[PDB]
Amino acid sequence: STGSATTTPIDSLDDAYITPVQIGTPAQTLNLDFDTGSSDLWVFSSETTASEVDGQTIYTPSKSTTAKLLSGATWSISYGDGSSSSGDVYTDTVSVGGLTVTGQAVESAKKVSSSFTEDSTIDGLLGLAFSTLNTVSPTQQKTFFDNAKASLDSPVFTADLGYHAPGTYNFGFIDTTAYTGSITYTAVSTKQGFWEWTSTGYAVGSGTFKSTSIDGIADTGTTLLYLPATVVSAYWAQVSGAKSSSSVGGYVFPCSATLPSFTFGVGSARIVIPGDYIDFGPISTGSSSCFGGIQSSAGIGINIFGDVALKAAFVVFNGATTPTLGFASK
Numbered sequence: 001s002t003g004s005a006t007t008t009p010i011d012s013l014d015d016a017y018i019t020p021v022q023i024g025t026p027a028q029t030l031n032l033d034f035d036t037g038s039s040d041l042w043v044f045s046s047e048t049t050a051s052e053v054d055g056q057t058i059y060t061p062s063k064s065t066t067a068k069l070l071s072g073a074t075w076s077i078s079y080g081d082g083s084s085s086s087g088d089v090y091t092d093t094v095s096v097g098g099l100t101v102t103g104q105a106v107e108s109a110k111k112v113s114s115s116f117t118e119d120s121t122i123d124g125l126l127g128l129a130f131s132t133l134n135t136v137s138p139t140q141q142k143t144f145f146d147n148a149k150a151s152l153d154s155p156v157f158t159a160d161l162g163y164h165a166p167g168t169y170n171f172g173f174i175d176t177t178a179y180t181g182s183i184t185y186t187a188v189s190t191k192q193g194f195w196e197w198t199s200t201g202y203a204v205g206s207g208t209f210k211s212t213s214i215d216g217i218a219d220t221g222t223t224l225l226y227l228p229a230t231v232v233s234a235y236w237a238q239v240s241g242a243k244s245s246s247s248v249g250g251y252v253f254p255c256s257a258t259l260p261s262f263t264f265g266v267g268s269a270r271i272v273i274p275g276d277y278i279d280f281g282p283i284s285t286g287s288s289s290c291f292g293g294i295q296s297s298a299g300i301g302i303n304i305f306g307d308v309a310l311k312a313a314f315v316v317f318n319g320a321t322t323p324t325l326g327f328a329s330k
């Protein structure tokens, strides 16, 4: 089997991407944030505290003939940005872009933190990291990808995120028309539960490439590119007027600036992030100070190849027995 679904930026900055997901019988379609940095599939629901729901589409398991309460199971998750959610668990039929999983754990939110409430466009998350990170207790549950894997033509999914445009998540096949050149594959460590890999270095604009190992995770659920302070300093030093602002919480730059590109290494191959991708616009409405898309990872404990980096590439998440990551230009 295969599946193919369009993923769409939630706003004009590409802060996140939503992908339609069918849950239950008859189908209830929710727009979920596909997150390769977590492993829970959770949704706003009929059980979510009413004061904490504001515009989202909710899953109502009582209206699904295939929904079954997973007796005694609860979940609770906190994300890197400080947001959180928790609730109980059903199993139900879940389809993504024509690919169907029966008996998928669908985690129903009883509580969500303010940032989820405030974002009307995201109805939940669909986690695509390794199932070892799943938070369901007392019996840990498998991701959608893990459940689908054996049925897929090939045990892979791919992320093809757009810049200020729709993109695609495919399951079970590699679309050879979606990228240019060849895909370069690189080794993955699963020891922390993430798609963790090692970039071979970087360049700033037309600068010379610096060979240096950068350990990081491929995370579709993180907006920006978070890299070591040395690297980030070297990038923003090439932008006149750029500075790290403790009050704003990172690097800002004059909105009148032209940003250089940023290249990262995948083995001997190179992915170029155009400078426009690194512009996240005014720090506040009407400001002439703009927020940078490349930020320091200091105090995270790991580097994060988030959407800024990933949307510059066609990315293969290979879930074979020995997982690997593939990157191609597009």
Ligand SMILES: NC[C@@H](O)c1ccc(Cl)cc1
Pocket (backbone or CB within 6 Å): 035, 036, 037, 038, 078, 079, 080, 081, 217, 219, 220, 221, 222, 300, 302, 303, 304
């Ligand atoms: N995208 C999931 C989010 O909780 C996350 C996961 C891992 C890191 Cl290092 C940062 C943020």
